[PDB]
Design a protein around this nucleic acid. Structure first.
Ligand SMILES: [Mg+2]
Ligand SMILES: [Zn+2]
Ligand SMILES: [Zn+2]
Ligand SMILES: [Zn+2]
Lengths: 123, 83, 145, 99, 199, 95, 578, 570
RNA sequence: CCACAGAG
């Protein structure tokens, strides 16, 4: 029948398992221990990501009780900081259709995030 | 919403055969689910014949939405259709 | 199902109590009706009322909880012992006083008879009021009007 | 089944379906070809459009988007056969009442 | 303590209830749907206060029952954050005290974190005791009226598990889940204790 | 219809009609189904063969309209019940 | 209290969205991985082996087993899918033509589309018009492929692109081989690719100078692995020009090559219960699934152990042929397999033909509540009436719901029972779910306790609406709707005036009787397909239901000029007609 | 494994879902989602999936976002140079704006810490901590804000000495070539720019001109090529610091210009570092340092990584391809900056190098020793250097870079699949089309080892099977299979594989940071930071330690992947 | 699962 013919190197007992793992077994030579230079590199990468995340270019979104009482007063304010229209865009780098959404005549300001050379990560 | 008002209706006031069949079917199903009847039955024990008797003197409370082929329906009460 | 808004208005406990007892009267569920028809005699009229066991449980529980007195004495709430005109009088009294909507709701819902209760409801009373205002709170609330 | 020896039933063929179409009797055709022959209640997921079992989508691993409908069992057989053929019929659903 | 919620919904009136008034039929169906049940992210429904808008009854082909899109205002039990309410103490444990509202809502659990400093648990009497200077007589006795302030209400979805896992759990249980709506009370200042404490 | 004499055959229905299921049910089941799968063409269930296969009511004949049962609620029966607290609530002592 | 509000909204199917299952979609819907060629284990007396083609976790093929995924029986389980990972990818026979077409449009070296930027923009703009039909879309795609074929060199790399086509277009394995002639449109321009090719071939003929006759026949073969790796590095923005929507995660061309084969549920491939022996025969799909598993395991063993490349490629081709025949049986010759003659039944065979799913079980199907009987005339019956034998009316039942108007009638019918004619065969209580037979019960306490919501299946009685049909259905008047009458002679009887639309003659004609089971269907049948409402054929509007022969003759003889009647004979004639 | 693994377990812990994604789309979407918001991620995903798209098309394709959200998202992406735009006028007169995607801004987001470290290292501020901190701050702000004006940055500085130092550092950065004036050229696609220039210089030729159409197109494309070459090097004109004399003999950057980070110069530096790493494994240890000094001396004048003309779709003509090859070979040789002698390396040579006993010919920064080092660099098997004239050396990038790619790919293959796979790959590369028996003879190991290792090697486009059929109906039983090796297939596949691995690492990092949101949010607070030991439960602090350690390992492995991957982008 | 044989 169809099971009859087998190649030279295979035996009647080796076939039939058909076990193919979904997990790899060959690792690239890049998973070694951390050193100090790439430690500083990771610190710089984390600092850059944190700097971009709270900046004036972030659209992450894809309390809040209507009742008011005295304990709601004397509370920490909203503390709004650097909106989209606050940044002083160069008007020549943008299409004309994008002018209206951003503030072209609104008072503008620019924020600067300080850089910490020291390791801000605990480990 | 998209409902044509009760004066700008531009569909025929006659009641077609398919509307008659669907109205009698729905009314017979409602009667078979133990709904009250507004006509004096004389011992008829079949929902379809009771629905026919109800239609004969225009007592069915249903109305027909004639959907024009652009998304704007059109209300017609069964008591208003001529047949 | 789609909740258009979580909050449309506020309801004082008088409103829910009156609405619920009107529901009992219309549906023949009060203790008077059941003790007159099902109990104390045999039914002859056969006046079967509206049947809804979950609604029985929830309305009976809420009317019992609103009927009993609140945490101000160790016999009834007083809300069940006061009418619409008394409510109008109470809000005309309370409007001119330095209170918010939530605080007015809480004090009309609970009707405090204790000083410590009144200071518990309002927030930072000493930073807004003086002793005569607390006193006059006590007699206007104690009058149940 | 087929044949009166096996107590089978009569076949409403393609042209009988065509004649019932020609009359326009929608409800009678639906009763004859779905309700009285092979009606089957199935659970379909709204998110992915596939089919599930016992109120559970085997792909999304959730039950918040399961809608129970009724289809002919031949339709379910066709959908499972197509899914075996690496063809994915994803059903998109909308409410009967638009309001 | 009670709010009005405006909800749009689709109700089904069976043909046998056409003799009843249609407002009454809509109210009865909405009461079957909503009475004494948790509306998620809203609270606990009690009764339908009234109806605002009703549309024409649409009929599904293959059924005689009438479907109506109805918008209604319903009373909902939902204490806002800040309201103080009274209740009856039901049970005590080593993690907090449980208080009910005489059958309205028994899922109120005041934790250890927001109780008085120096509170401790007596298991032989199963009560909570707290002095201030020398008054050790303060007991959180069972079936006694208490006052408490709402501090945090939590909503959790049921999220049913796999049918094989549900079957396995059913087999292991016939040989359990957090309440979908819960409120955490607190007792921090004066007047937040029992009923027989301040008079 | 479509600007050219397309005729009534398997090569003409494939041009006149864009419904996947009807063309699959008529002739060349495998080829039409696989081409529909490859090109990812959505099929709108609006025809008659689609409605019969999927077991839902068609859009012609008695299915060409929706039957609606009238209700006897007037707008004057839907006046909202008064909210006593919100009516009586007024702010003068604060702002 | 503790339960959340449950809400249900009725829904209908808005539409289908055909696609191809990705690897993640195939595995995610799977329940068990098929990793053996053995269906049964001999230590449990032929039970389904775990991780086999037959497997409980897939479903059940017998009434006495359990699914172990929903723990249902045969009549309550929907079946579940398995998955099978092939050792090496193979071409899909259905998408093979599409694979050739998409290989004709991309660069065979860097995997980029063979279109200039402006022409690409123009074609994309012409596809996205707001009224594009299927025909216009197919025409624009064909023009895109024509332009891609007309390109000679890729715009992203200096690579010569030839022609991509089939190998031999036969019934054998060569039907599933793709070749790419690089140097077809080369002329004498002496491309560097030609220099590289002639250098390699001079090098290889430096050792074996007998393959010179086979140099011309050597083109760039596109094995399925190379095709998969070429599709994997295609640009996503180029998928639209090839007719594939890439917004969905399964919109890549890589989905159109077999990497994971979904094992079907055993519900749609049921093992035969018994064939004159306790042994169970298997459907051809299960045997092919076991063969595919064996071949994949053999290929993996050869790969990780080390076998001659001729044998490895031979087994790759055998796996491809096995999968292709598992999908479409007549695509390949069964003799090309080493095992093999009756052709097997594939999925394409199950979906095509007069006995396929589409024309045999979906467009039309066998229905319940029907009867087939020889016909005979009955002139004393009204034209809107058909006579049914009582021996049939005792079997065909109408399910009537108990109401306030027919409670006494249905109580009397239940009391009568299923033996006398006016009566019932089954009763279904309102709260219950399984019908109780109206033969073993008391039949009296059931009648007294008849609720107002129960459904009783009464016998077919007078005045009931029945569809009545003759099998050759040329026009819509071949099926009509009559009122039932009950007569004791074992033959359907219809008035001869209704013979003409049926084209029926009483010479052994067998005609069919359908009984609708819902009120809506019954009303629609009687008010649309009734004999009274269909006196005119819609072809021309002329009457087609009228006096047939032997009614015209007698009417003529009565209306003859020289026929005269006195009071007695005239009165008798008038009495006979009414 | 010891137990069967259900498909639920496979879909849960294994990354089977991520394997079905296009590596380009996966990497770009993950980078934008990690750095910018989710709306920007969806916009970039739609732009990658469907090519160029109008704002109305972006509104229609992305549900849940209106025109205002799409427009502000496009502004946010355009500020960080992650979206290229172009205005098109219809024939009727309609105006439309098509937004593209560009690898420039995305790679800038990808190479961020690497760019900062390269700026810190390459301007010899390794011994001035204050200037190092200022340089790091200004470069981080430049990358974060994309393009900024100098005067508005100086408005955030309230010390005159700090302002002077920052201005000096800006002038130094512009002089070194790490900051350029951003313009509309950086926002237009190269293909459309070449199309516009070609059409302008083609229609300029008058109609009914007395020459053939092929000659017309050839002349037009030569003129367009000259104009395009003039357009491209405009940021390299060094006119950004021409404003002089605010005080006595001072040069400063222009105040109103907008400066941005130059990606091409950074990639040139990365090419230099890759070449130094290649040279470190072939000749010497101080020879590599001499080569490093030579490359860092002529780094700024080196030809660009990618010849942008090649990306114009002009390679469809073989003549244009060989012209590109010849011009690329000529520019790296005849550019005056690139050529150097032994003497020019003596000035910049560090004092720590000795070079005295480095070489033994028989068995103090001297020029002859430098000449010998340059000669042995030139006289190696790998062409690191070449001599146009004696005493003159230059780096032959065109003939060196394919060698670098081949060596890196071969060593990747070795470190993955054993040295036997590397040996077989090199043997197949040497004998361009080789049978199995010739491999068996010419590579000395067992035949089954060859069969197994080449069966492994087929899966990665390393070796191509060429089928020679000796019959009409092709079949493996009656055919012979030869093996070849194509560089482009293997390089493209390895590039895609490394890109997918980078994207998968970023996805795992983002999931890890997402599922520990509460503790991480409590940790990175102004009050909590520094007082982590005091304000955290010990198990919570340990969880913070493991989370941070995992994130740092992720970024280290990403840096190593980038080093391994940038070789194939050249 | 096929193939005969009849009935329209
Ligand atoms: Mg005949
Ligand atoms: Zn799903
Ligand atoms: Zn099952
Ligand atoms: Zn190419």
């Amino acid at each position: 029948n169809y099971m009859s013919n087998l190649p030279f190197g295979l035996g009647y007992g080796d076939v039939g398992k058909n076990h193919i793992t979904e997990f790899p077994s060959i690792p690239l030579p890049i998973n070694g221990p951390i050193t100090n230079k790439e430690r500083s590199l990771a610190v710089k990468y984390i600092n850059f990501g944190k700097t971009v995340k709270d900046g004036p270019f972030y659209t992450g979104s894809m309390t809040n009780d209507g009742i008011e009482r005295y304990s709601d007063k004397y509370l920490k304010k909203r503390k709004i900081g650097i909106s989209i229209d606050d940044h002083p865009y160069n008007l020549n780098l943008f299409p004309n259709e994008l002018y209206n959404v951003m503030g072209i005549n609104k008072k503008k300001l620019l924020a600067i995030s300080k850089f910490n050379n020291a390791d801000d990560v605990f480990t | 919403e998209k409902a044509i008002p009760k004066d700008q209706r531009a569909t025929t006031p006659y009641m077609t055969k398919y509307e008659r069949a669907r109205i009698l079917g729905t009314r017979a199903l409602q009667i078979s689910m133990n709904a009250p009847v507004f006509v004096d039955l004389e011992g008829e024990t079949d929902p379809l014949r009771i629905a026919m008797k109800e239609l004969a003197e225009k007592k069915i409370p249903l109305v027909i939405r004639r959907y024009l082929p652009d998304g704007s329906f059109e209300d017609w009460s069964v008591e208003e259709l001529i047949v | 199902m789609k909740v258009l808004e979580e909050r449309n208005a506020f309801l004082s406990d008088y409103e829910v109590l009156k609405f619920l007892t009107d529901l009992e009267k219309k549906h023949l569920w009060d203790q008077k009706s059941l003790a007159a028809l099902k109990k104390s005699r045999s039914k002859g009229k056969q006046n079967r009322p509206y049947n809804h066991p979950e609604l029985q449980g929830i309305t009976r529980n809420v009317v019992n909880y609103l009927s009993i007195n609140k945490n101000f004495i160790n016999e009834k709430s007083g809300i069940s012992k006061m009418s619409d005109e008394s409510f109008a009088e109470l809000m005309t009294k309370l409007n001119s006083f330095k209170l918010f909507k939530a605080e007015k709701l809480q004090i009309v819902n609970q009707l405090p008879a204790n000083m410590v209760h009144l200071y518990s409801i309002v927030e930072e009373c000493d930073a807004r009021f003086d002793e005569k205002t607390i006193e006059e709170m006590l007699e206007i609330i104690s009058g149940y009007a | 089944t087929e044949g009166r020896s096996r107590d089978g039933g009569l076949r409403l063929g393609e042209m009988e379906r065509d004649c019932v179409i020609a009359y326009g009797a929608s409800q009678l055709l639906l009763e004859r070809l779905m309700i009285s022959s092979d009606a089957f209640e199935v659970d379909v997921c709204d998110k992915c459009g596939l089919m599930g079992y016992s109120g559970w989508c085997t792909t999304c691993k959730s039950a918040e988007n399961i809608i129970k409908m009724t289809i002919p069992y031949a339709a379910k057989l066709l959908f499972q056969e197509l899914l075996s053929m690496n063809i994915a019929p994803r059903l998109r659903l909308e409410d009967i009442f638009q309001q | 303590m009670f709010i009005l919620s405006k909800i749009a919904d689709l109700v089904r009136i069976p043909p046998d209830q056409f003799h009843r008034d249609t407002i009454s039929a809509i109210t009865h169906q909405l009461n079957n749907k909503f009475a004494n049940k948790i509306i998620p992210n809203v609270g606990l429904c009690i009764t339908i206060y009234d109806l605002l808008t009703v549309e024409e009854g649409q009929l599904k082909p293959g059924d005689g029952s009438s479907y109506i899109n109805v918008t209604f205002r319903a009373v909902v039990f939902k204490p806002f954050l800040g309201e103080i309410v009274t209740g009856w103490i039901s049970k005590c444990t080593a993690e907090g005290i449980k208080v009910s509202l005489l059958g309205i809502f028994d899922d109120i659990f005041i934790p250890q974190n927001m109780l008085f400093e120096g509170c401790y648990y007596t298991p032989e009497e199963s009560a909570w005791i707290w002095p201030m200077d020398e008054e050790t007589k303060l007991y959180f006795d069972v079936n006694e009226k208490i006052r408490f302030r709402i501090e945090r209400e939590v909503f959790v979805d049921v999220k049913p598990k796999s049918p094989k896992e549900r079957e396995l759990e059913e087999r292991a249980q016939l040989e359990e889940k957090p309440p979908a709506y819960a409120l955490l009370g607190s007792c921090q200042t004066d007047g937040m204790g029992l009923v027989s404490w301040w008079e | 219809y479509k600007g050219e004499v397309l005729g009534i055959t398997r090569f003409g229905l494939s041009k006149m009609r864009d419904s996947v299921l009807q063309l699959a049910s008529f002739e060349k089941t495998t080829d039409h189904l696989f081409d529909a799968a490859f090109y990812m063409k959505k099929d709108a269930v609006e025809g008659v063969s689609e409605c019969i296969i999927l077991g839902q009511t068609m859009s012609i004949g008695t299915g060409s309209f929706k039957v609606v049962k009238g209700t006897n609620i007037s707008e004057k029966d839907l006046v909202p019940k008064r909210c006593l607290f919100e009516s009586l609530s007024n702010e003068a002592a604060l702002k | 209290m503790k339960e959340v509000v449950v809400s249900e909204t009725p829904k209908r199917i808005k539409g289908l969205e055909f696609s191809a299952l990705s690897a993640a979609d195939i595995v995610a819907q799977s329940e068990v991985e098929v990793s053996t060629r053995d269906l049964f284990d001999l230590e449990k007396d032929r039970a389904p082996k775990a991780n086999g083609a037959l497997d409980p976790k897939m479903g059940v093929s017998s009434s006495s087993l359990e699914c172990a995924t929903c723990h249902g029986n045969l009549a309550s389980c929907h079946g579940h899918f398995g998955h099978l990972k092939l050792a090496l990818p193979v071409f899909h026979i259905g998408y093979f033509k599409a694979t050739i077409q998409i290989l004709q449009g991309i660069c065979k070296n860097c995997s980029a589309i063979l279109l200039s930027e402006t022409d690409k923009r123009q074609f994309l703009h012409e596809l996205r018009r707001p009224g594009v039909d299927n025909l216009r879309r197919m025409g624009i795609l064909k023009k895109i492929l024509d332009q891609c074929k007309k390109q000679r060199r890729c715009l992203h790399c200096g690579a010569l692109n030839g022609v991509v086509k089939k190998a031999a277009a036969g019934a054998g394995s060569a039907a599933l081989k793709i070749i790419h002639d690089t140097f077809r449109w080369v002329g004498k321009k002496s491309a560097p690719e030609k220099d590289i090719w002639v250098g390699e071939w001079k090098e290889v003929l430096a050792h074996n100078p007998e393959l010179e006759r086979y140099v011309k026949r050597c083109m760039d073969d596109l094995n399925p692995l190379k095709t998969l790796n070429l599709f994997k590095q295609i640009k996503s923005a180029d998928c639209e020009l090839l007719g594939i929507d890439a917004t969905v995660p399964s919109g890549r061309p890589e989905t159109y090559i077999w990497r994971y084969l979904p094992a079907p549920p055993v519900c749609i491939r049921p093992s035969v219960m018994m064939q004159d022996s306790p042994a169970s025969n298997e459907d051809d799909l299960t045997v092919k699934l076991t063969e595919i598993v064996w071949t994949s395991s053999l290929i993996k063993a050869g790969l990780d152990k080390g076998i001659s490349i001729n044998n490895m490629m031979e087994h790759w081709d055998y796996l491809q042929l096995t999968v292709a025949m598992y999908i479409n049986s007549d695509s390949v010759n069964p003799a090309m397999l080493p095992g093999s003659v009756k052709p097997i039944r594939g999925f394409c065979q199950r979906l095509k033909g007069k006995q396929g799913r589409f024309r045999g079980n979906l467009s039309g199907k066998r229905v319940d509540f029907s009867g087939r009987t020889v016909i005979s005339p009955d002139p004393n019956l009204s034209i809107d009436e058909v006579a049914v034998p009582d021996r049939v009316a005792k079997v065909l039942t109408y399910p009537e719901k108990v109401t306030r108007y027919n409670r006494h009638k249905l109580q009397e019918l239940i009391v009568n029972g299923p033996n006398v004619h006016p009566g019932a065969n089954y009763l279904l209580k309102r709260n219950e779910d399984a019908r109780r037979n109206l033969r073993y019960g008391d039949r009296m306490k059931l009648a007294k306790n008849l609720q107002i919501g129960d459904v009783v299946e009464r016998h077919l009685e007078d005045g009931d609406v029945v569809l009545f049909n003759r099998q050759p259905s040329l026009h819509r008047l071949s099926i009509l709707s009559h009122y039932a009458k009950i007569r004791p002679w074992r033959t359907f009887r219809l008035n001869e005036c209704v013979c003409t639309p049926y084209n029926a003659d009483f010479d052994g004609d067998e005609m069919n009787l359908h009984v609708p089971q819902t009120e809506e269907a019954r009303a629609e049948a009687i008010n649309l397909m009734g004999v009274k409402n269909n006196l005119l054929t819609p072809k021309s509007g002329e009457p087609i239901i009228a006096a047939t022969q032997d009614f015209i003759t007698g009417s003529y003889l009565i209306s003859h000029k020289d026929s005269f009647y006195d009071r007695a004979t005239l009165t008798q004639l008038l009495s006979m007609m009414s | 494994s010891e137990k069967l693994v259900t498909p639920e377990d496979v879909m849960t812990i294994s990354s089977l879902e991520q394997r079905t994604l296009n590596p380009d789309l996966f990497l770009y979407k993950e980078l934008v989602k990690a750095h910018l918001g989710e709306r920007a991620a969806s916009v970039i995903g739609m732009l990658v999936a469907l090519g160029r798209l109008s704002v109305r098309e972006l509104v229609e394709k992305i549900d849940g976002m209106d025109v205002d959200s799409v427009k502000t998202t496009l502004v946010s992406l355009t500020q960080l140079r992650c979206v290229k735009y172009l205005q098109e006028t219809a024939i009727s007169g309609k105006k439309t704006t098509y937004y593209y995607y560009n690898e420039e801004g995305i790679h800038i987001l990808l190479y961020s810490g690497l760019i900062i470290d390269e700026i810190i290292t390459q301007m010899r501020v390794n011994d001035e901590e204050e200037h190092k901190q200022l340089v790091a701050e200004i470069v981080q702000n430049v990358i974060s804000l994309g393009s900024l004006t100098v005067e508005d940055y100086l408005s955030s500085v309230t010390s005159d000495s700090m302002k002077y130092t920052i201005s000096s550092l800006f002038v130094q950065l512009c002089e070194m070539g790490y900051l350029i004036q951003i313009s509309k050229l950086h926002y237009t696609p190269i293909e459309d720019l070449w199309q516009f220039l070609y059409e302008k210089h083609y229609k300029n030729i008058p109609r009914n001109s007395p020459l053939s159409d092929l000659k017309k197109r050839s002349q037009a494309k030569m003129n367009a090529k000259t104009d395009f070459a003039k357009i491209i090097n405009k940021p390299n004109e060094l006119s950004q610091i021409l404003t002089v004399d605010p005080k006595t003999s001072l040069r400063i950057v222009k105040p109103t210009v907008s400066l941005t980070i130059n990606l091409d110069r950074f990639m040139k530096g990365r090419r230099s570092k890759q070449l130094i790493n290649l040279a470190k494994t072939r000749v010497g240890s101080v020879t590599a340092q001499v080569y490093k000094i030579a490359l860092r001396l002529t780094e700024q004048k080196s030809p660009k990584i990618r010849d942008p003309l090649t990306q114009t779709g002009l390679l469809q003509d073989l003549e244009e391809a060989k012209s590109f090859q010849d011009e690329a070979e000529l520019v790296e040789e005849k550019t005056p900056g690139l050529t150097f002698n032994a003497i020019d390396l003596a000035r910049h040579l560090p004092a720590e190098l000795d070079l005295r006993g480095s070489l033994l010919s028989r068995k103090p920064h001297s020029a002859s020793l430098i000449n010998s080092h340059l000669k042995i660099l030139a006289s190696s098997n790998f062409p690191f250097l070449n001599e146009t004239k004696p005493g003159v050396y230059y780096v032959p990038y065109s003939k060196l870079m394919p060698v670098l790619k081949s060596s890196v790919y071969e060593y990747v293959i070795a470190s993955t699949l054993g040295p036997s796979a590397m040996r077989l790959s090199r043997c197949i590369r040497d004998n361009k089309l080789v049978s199995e028996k010739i491999i068996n003879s010419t590579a000395l190991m067992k035949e089954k080892d060859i069969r197994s290792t080449l069966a492994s090697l087929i899966r990665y486009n390393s070796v191509e099977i060429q089928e020679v059929p000796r019959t009409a109906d092709r079949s493996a039983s009656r055919a012979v299979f030869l093996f070849r090796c194509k560089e482009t297939h293997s390089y493209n596949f390895m590039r895609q594989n490394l890109e997918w691995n980078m994207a998968n690492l970023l996805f795992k990092k983002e999931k890890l940071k997402q599922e520990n949101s509460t503790l991480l949010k409590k940790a990175n607070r102004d009050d909590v930071k520094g007082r982590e030991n005091e304000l955290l439960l010990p198990s919570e602090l340990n969880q913070l330690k493991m989370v941070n350690e995992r994130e740092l390992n992720v970024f280290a492995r990403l840096s190593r992947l980038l080093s391994l991957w940038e070789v194939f982008q050249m």
